[PDB]
Write a protein that binds this ligand. Structure first.
Ligand SMILES: Brc1ccc([C@H]2CN3CCSC3=N2)cc1
Lengths: 245, 281
């Protein structure tokens, strides 16, 4: 039944066979497959799968001896423009590059033009031609300030936006507890949510309190807090907070 | 019927085509022109060799209508044994449903699936295959279709490719506490192993990244192999650096137990936001 379904499928796939008034036989069906491919890309599969392109450089000096045209779709450059890989790569990657010049494999962020860099996973090998690298570079898939706390409320992490949001340089904020900056009247409430976000392990509460500015102005703020747990231990390593003016 | 078949076979190497059966020259013929149907809609020894992986096209209902020729170099099973048979017949059932919904229906896909391996780190055969995690990135495209390249993650106890300056090894407990680090990282990121030892890896990632690590970590555990995205570990005296790490779970070969996680960590950037300070350390 499956040989026949291959017989039938094959013929459906041979336009020369399936453009016919009837269904012929296997000797014939086998025969017209044979001629239909006796009649009659990988880089498209590559660029269609990973947004990769091929390129060939000299190992001795790092200058290009071949570039696939996929460079234009992949990273917007003209094949005519793609020279020396060192000119194409981010300056902070020259070093890395030079020791990759057995097979080879690495990563580096190369420019795009119309200064923007795109990180590209590179794969290939060295062949003799005083030698050459044969590689494929592929592309990858992808007001408020955020802080983070140990269970007790001590600032373990803050991003620079704290100075824009509360006026304190990170360092002043870090190490201290938040309730040190809360307004007295609101402090249990802050602690409450801290007593709560843990009790409600996993997901968020939000709490609002007057936070101390550096110029000492009490500021209304809303904080969205959730505990973050180890994916292995389920240990509550920290609770993450985004504190929002 | 043998004469017609063996020049069908030998206009599909005449070496490998000399040995094909009925059902398989059927499958290879059928899938060759089926593939050609998709390529018309998309639009070598070095292309093929220069891949740390093979390319596969897989239908929304699961058939493998084409696999990379170099497939056998990574997974042992050659191009001709598995073409046209189901992907579901060669990958982990616990991964299957996730594979199913990657075949289904934003175009870009990126994930990890365990297949079957029958090439030793020479060759053994199906009853003694081992499951091999594959990192797969591609497009799903219109009958639907999946076009992924599949890269195996090099195992860090047995590596073939050199490693440059900007990479540093690392060992962790299964919950990812640093339980050993490379000495250079100091010159790289600026920490001696001493401080890192006994420390959760998670108090060194920048906060916006922690959620994306969890997935990498659970992939690592459930499958035992993984590549992270880009992320930034916080650095010595302020700023961070960008890393990509291959993380594999290594076992004691004596008691069949998970022992630790070893990670190769490619540094991709020098310190950035050096002025700013993020964490207590
Ligand atoms: Br996947 C994955 C996620 C994290 C890690 C470890 C290794 N390493 C290098 C500096 S920060 C850090 N955490 C390994 C694999």
């Amino acid at each position: 039944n499956k040989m026949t379904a291959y017989i039938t499928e094959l013929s459906d796939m041979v336009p020369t066979c399936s453009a016919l008034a009837r269904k012929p036989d296997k000797l014939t069906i086998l025969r017209m497959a044979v001629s239909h491919m006796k009649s009659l890309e990988l880089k498209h599969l590559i660029l269609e799968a990973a947004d990769g392109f091929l390129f060939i450089v000299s190992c001795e000096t790092g200058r290009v001896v071949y570039v696939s045209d996929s460079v234009t779709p992949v990273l917007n450059q003209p094949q005519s423009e793609w020279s020396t890989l060192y000119d194409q790569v981010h300056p902070d990657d020259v070093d890395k590059l030079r020791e990759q010049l057995s097979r080879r494999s690495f990563i580096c962020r190369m420019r795009c033009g119309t200064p923007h860099f795109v990180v590209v996973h590179c794969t290939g090998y060295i062949k003799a031609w005083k030698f050459c690298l044969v590689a494929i570079g592929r592309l990858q898939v992808t007001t408020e300030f955020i802080s983070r706390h140990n269970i007790e409320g001590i600032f373990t992490f803050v991003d620079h936006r704290c100075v824009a949001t509360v006026g304190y340089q990170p360092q002043e904020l870090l190490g201290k507890n938040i309730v040190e900056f809360c307004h007295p009247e609101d402090q249990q409430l802050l602690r409450d949510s801290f007593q709560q976000v843990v009790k409600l392990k996993g997901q968020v509460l939000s709490v609002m309190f007057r936070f101390r500015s550096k110029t000492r102005e009490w500021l209304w703020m809303r904080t969205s807090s959730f505990t973050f747990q180890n994916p292995y231990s389920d240990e509550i390593e920290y609770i993450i907070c985004t504190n929002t003016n | 019927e043998t004469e017609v078949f063996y020049e069908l076979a030998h206009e599909l190497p005449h070496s490998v085509s000399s040995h094909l059966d009925k059902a398989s020259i059927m499958r290879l013929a059928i899938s060759f022109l089926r593939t050609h149907k998709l390529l018309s809609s998309v639009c070598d020894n070095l292309y093929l060799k220069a891949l740390e992986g093979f390319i596969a096209v897989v239908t929304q209902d699961g058939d493998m209508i084409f696999l990379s020729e170099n497939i056998s170099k990574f997974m042992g099973l050659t191009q001709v044994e598995l073409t046209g048979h189901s992907i579901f017949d060669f990958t982990h059932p616990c991964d299957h449903e996730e594979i199913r919904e990657n075949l289904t229906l934003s175009t870009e896909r990126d994930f990890f699936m365990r297949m079957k391996c029958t090439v030793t780190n020479r060759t053994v055969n199906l009853k003694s295959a081992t499951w091999k995690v594959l990192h797969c990135t591609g497009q799903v495209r219109v009958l639907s279709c999946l076009i992924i390249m599949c890269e195996p993650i090099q195992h860090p106890s047995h590596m073939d490719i050199p490693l440059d300056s900007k990479t540093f090894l690392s060992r962790h407990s299964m919950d990812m506490k640093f339980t050993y680090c490379d000495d250079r990282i100091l010159e790289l990121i600026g920490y001696h192993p001493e401080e890192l030892l006994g420390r959760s890896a998670y108090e060194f990632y920048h906060a916006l990244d922690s959620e994306n690590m969890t997935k990498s970590h659970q992939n690592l555990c459930t499958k035992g192999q993984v590549v992270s995205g880009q992320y930034r570990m916080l650095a010595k005296h302020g700023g961070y650096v960008w890393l990509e790490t291959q993380g594999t779970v290594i076992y004691n070969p004596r008691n069949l137990q998970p022992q630790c996680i070893m990670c190769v960590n490619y540094v991709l950037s020098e310190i950035e936001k050096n002025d700013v300070v993020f964490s207590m350390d």
